Amino acid sequence: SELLVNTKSGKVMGTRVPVLSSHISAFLGIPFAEPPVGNMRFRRPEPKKPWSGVWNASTYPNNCQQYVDEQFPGFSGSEMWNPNREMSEDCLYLNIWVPSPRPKSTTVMVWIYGGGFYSGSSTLDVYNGKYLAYTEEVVLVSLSYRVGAFGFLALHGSQEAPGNVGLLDQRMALQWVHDNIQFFGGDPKTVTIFGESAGGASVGMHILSPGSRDLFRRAILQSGSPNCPWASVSVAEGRRRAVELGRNLNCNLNSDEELIHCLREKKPQELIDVEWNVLPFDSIFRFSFVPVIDGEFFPTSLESMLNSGNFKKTQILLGVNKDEGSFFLLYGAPGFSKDSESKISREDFMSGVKLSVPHANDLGLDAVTLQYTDWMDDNNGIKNRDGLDDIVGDHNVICPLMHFVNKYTKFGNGTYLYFFNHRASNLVWPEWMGVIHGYEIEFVFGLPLVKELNYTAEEEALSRRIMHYWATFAKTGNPNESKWPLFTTKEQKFIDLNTEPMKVHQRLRVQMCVFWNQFLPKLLNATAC
Amino acid sequence: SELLVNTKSGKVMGTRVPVLSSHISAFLGIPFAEPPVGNMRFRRPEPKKPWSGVWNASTYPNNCQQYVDEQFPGFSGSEMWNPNREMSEDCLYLNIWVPSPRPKSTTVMVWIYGGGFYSGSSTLDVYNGKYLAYTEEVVLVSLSYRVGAFGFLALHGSQEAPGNVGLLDQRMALQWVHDNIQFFGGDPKTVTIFGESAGGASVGMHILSPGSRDLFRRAILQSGSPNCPWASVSVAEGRRRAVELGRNLNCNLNSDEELIHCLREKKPQELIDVEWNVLPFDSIFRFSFVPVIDGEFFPTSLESMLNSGNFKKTQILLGVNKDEGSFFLLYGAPGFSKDSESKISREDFMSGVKLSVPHANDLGLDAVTLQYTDWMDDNNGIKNRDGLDDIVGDHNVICPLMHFVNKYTKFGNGTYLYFFNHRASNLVWPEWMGVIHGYEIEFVFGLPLVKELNYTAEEEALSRRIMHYWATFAKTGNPNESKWPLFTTKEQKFIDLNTEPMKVHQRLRVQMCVFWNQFLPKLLNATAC
Ligand SMILES: C/C=C1\[C@H]2C=C(C)C[C@]1(N)c1ccc(=O)[nH]c1C2
Numbered sequence A, B: 001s002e003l004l005v006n007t008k009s010g011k012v013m014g015t016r017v018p019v020l021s022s023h024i025s026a027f028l029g030i031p032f033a034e035p036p037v038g039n040m041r042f043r044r045p046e047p048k049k050p051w052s053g054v055w056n057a058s059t060y061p062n063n064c065q066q067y068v069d070e071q072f073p074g075f076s077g078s079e080m081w082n083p084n085r086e087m088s089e090d091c092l093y094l095n096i097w098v099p100s101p102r103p104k105s106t107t108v109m110v111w112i113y114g115g116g117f118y119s120g121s122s123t124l125d126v127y128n129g130k131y132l133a134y135t136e137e138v139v140l141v142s143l144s145y146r147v148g149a150f151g152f153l154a155l156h157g158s159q160e161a162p163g164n165v166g167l168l169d170q171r172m173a174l175q176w177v178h179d180n181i182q183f184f185g186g187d188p189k190t191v192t193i194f195g196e197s198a199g200g201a202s203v204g205m206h207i208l209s210p211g212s213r214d215l216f217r218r219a220i221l222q223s224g225s226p227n228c229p230w231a232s233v234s235v236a237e238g239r240r241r242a243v244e245l246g247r248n249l250n251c252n253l254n255s256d257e258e259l260i261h262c263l264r265e266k267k268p269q270e271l272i273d274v275e276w277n278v279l280p281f282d283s284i285f286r287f288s289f290v291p292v293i294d295g296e297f298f299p300t301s302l303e304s305m306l307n308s309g310n311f312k313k314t315q316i317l318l319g320v321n322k323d324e325g326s327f328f329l330l331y332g333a334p335g336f337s338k339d340s341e342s343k344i345s346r347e348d349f350m351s352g353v354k355l356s357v358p359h360a361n362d363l364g365l366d367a368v369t370l371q372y373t374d375w376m377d378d379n380n381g382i383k384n385r386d387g388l389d390d391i392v393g394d395h396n397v398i399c400p401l402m403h404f405v406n407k408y409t410k411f412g413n414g415t416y417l418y419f420f421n422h423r424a425s426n427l428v429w430p431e432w433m434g435v436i437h438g439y440e441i442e443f444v445f446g447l448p449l450v451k452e453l454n455y456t457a458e459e460e461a462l463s464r465r466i467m468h469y470w471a472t473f474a475k476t477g478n479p480n481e482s483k484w485p486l487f488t489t490k491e492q493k494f495i496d497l498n499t500e501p502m503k504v505h506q507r508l509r510v511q512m513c514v515f516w517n518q519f520l521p522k523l524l525n526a527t528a529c
């Protein structure tokens, strides 16, 4: 039967799902590891003891325990990202949408969700791979990994909570996809891992981690790099946050094993309640438990790996959205509110700047302000709001990404860079937010084909085209069958992705990124002598 | 007789000079101090022992010994600024053009020449006050002061060469003008001292020095402030240069009195030959012997005087030209040449930046480059040439001047700011140089009225209008009889001065000057901790 599949782990019974007036198969909730519950919490994942009988893969799995966004209860625009299934520590499952009739051996796309490493679910409506599987005849897998403390608590040196275990869950699912996707019609040598935000940071961390490189062919990174300032922490810093979390829960802190035993006692929601109390600064775009540059998953400083070519050479398609900062300012910067134009006073601008660049001394905060201020219209609240949106985006996504692109492109086998600047016509967020972090995802996954969702003919068009760019790059390592120029360190070409006739540009935010990637760091290092 | 005048010093016999189809009187070369020759070299000036019989004031005086510009022998454009009379240490003389018929008591304008404190002559063709005296019926006096080592060598503590003595010559001439200009038709309570470059720096230093404030009513500062980075040196630094000059002349350096006795032995040209060998850096827009913040002429750091209001409160008219840097890059920056478009390589740009900001560490030079570079077209030689012209102008004239204006305006009784952006149609310098340092001077002095000089009807127009602005401000403390807005620290209004219909603008180069006046200094102070 089209829905019955035999994998090296046992049989799996899928389900037929309708899509655009036709159908496809879906095997939802295939386990890829032993449920990391009990004493296994914080531990590295374990492969799933094979089973007997058919696994019923007819319905989405549980979602990993995680912080639920309650900032705008009832607001679809924020609730669409919240877990839509019972959350549970038993959440390590993967989903596979497969064309019908099952292909013999076609391109695979593995989606890695990316909510700042503290959240994410593979079951979100925007992550429904059926339109993409169906439309581009690719096997689409979306995995799940432990987020938050559960996936990234790190007591380096311990074996009970070594850290990065959420990255190992991803690897484990990549491993399972490698070993079994052939039975579903996929070609395990043409697997493109793609992800957004912390997912794009994950993708890039698989391209760097030695133990992950062989499990995938090429990569797509959306608004995220492994080198983003919020993506990783030193082992010392990761240890510090582990202790503090422990401190917020009244744990014996005499030793790792006491601390870890205490944390394993806590119910999942107790870790989540005090999860944000451990950041070391008042800041926005900083999350608590993230990958630690431990020396195992990452041999060394991401920067030395990047400089030395120590990373998988393949082709990558990456890019950023126009307004990456909006979402984070809205949620944590004073002066921003959802139902107003959030015009910003220079006094709030200065509070935002400081929240956006926590590790900077005053001279640093001084260089940021000088750089993002129109001194000839400095009390302009619209310029200050937008000037802050840029600060947060450039610093956190755009510039660390242009640093990865230029570092990668010197050793990779093809780089394609896009700039998403299209605001969905049916967006329910305030217009001041612009083209928001996470809002290309819906075009990539083809929601604009669902009439009942109300996009515009030009938007459906942009979806089909972006999907064809993703699918076609997954298959051949090139997005083109209007050419999307390859990106070279000399020309710096990239393109716009919007309902208008794409244009090619060069040097995506050079001026600003020279500031963030080259000047600021030098400044912050100088001043400290 | 209209040409015979009796002053408290003796009688003076002038001469009638033609001008624009009419005539006026001129008393040229009236001594205002004892010739500072011999053992008086470096000494403070002395009042001129009165004389008997008429002093023949029918012909221009000698010019103070000074560096002659031989960079473009034969080039009028550079030779027009060179001494046009026998140079001599006996050069302390003043010139007075007086309307005919002699006025009873009219406005006086005293011109202070300004070649970086190392050169200048009151006898230059562009400094011929007759067109201004005649056209605006004002008594025009142009004084002369010792330049170079002769006027600014400073062995602080010595009485033989105390320093600033070139500023005291100016004061002395102001004193003489005060005490005798009534006999020529001037009103000694309506004396406006005006100057360009080192002269505008001198003007502003008279507004600050206690012992000078009472001798003049209001002031006009052209492309110069007392706070320009090249205008003064600490007493320690001034001492250092005195010793080095002495070292270049093989002087006993056992003591000031030996050094000074040696220097008084040297012929004037020997001091001039090694005059530039004492600068402490490889730099452009830095001159050797300049005023020293000694504690007598200047009670304290110009910055504390400015901050505390410790300065003459009156009204001032000041401004800058569009391209203040050209002239200095042409003469000392690699890559610039008079007969080419001087497009600049980024390698030369980097050599220029370093020459332009000598006191900066690498991080400073890094901030300058980041700020003046179009990182999206960085090998553009035209952008790099212009970007350097701006660096030199902003740092050296425009921004230190906007810092004086904002400091002054908080205590002054009226500030009027202009931006000269007009390139004389008959300029013989390369076009890349733009509106050059020193090129408003010819419009201020009304040369554009001399047909035989070939300006355009619109330029003659601009002359008459600028002169009327200078004359009318001298007389009433306001340039207006299209209003030239007053400048306030809140509005920052200034106007353009060019053959086009003047417009009012605000915040002359704020962005850049915030960099030079606020960020760079803070940066350079931070980095050194
Ligand atoms: C635009 C919304 C976002 C993006 C980044 C983060 C950190 C939170 C977020 N709610 C979220 C939550 C879950 C998820 O899968 N992705 C994202 C993307």
Ligand SMILES: C/C=C1\[C@H]2C=C(C)C[C@]1(N)c1ccc(=O)[nH]c1C2
Pocket (backbone or CB within 6 Å): B069, B081, B113, B114, B115, B116, B117, B119, B120, B121, B197, B327, B436, B437, B438, B439
């Ligand atoms: C544009 C030419 C200039 C200006 C500045 C300086 C330093 C030298 C100069 N040759 C000079 C020489 C003599 C003078 O009186 N003024 C000036 C103005």
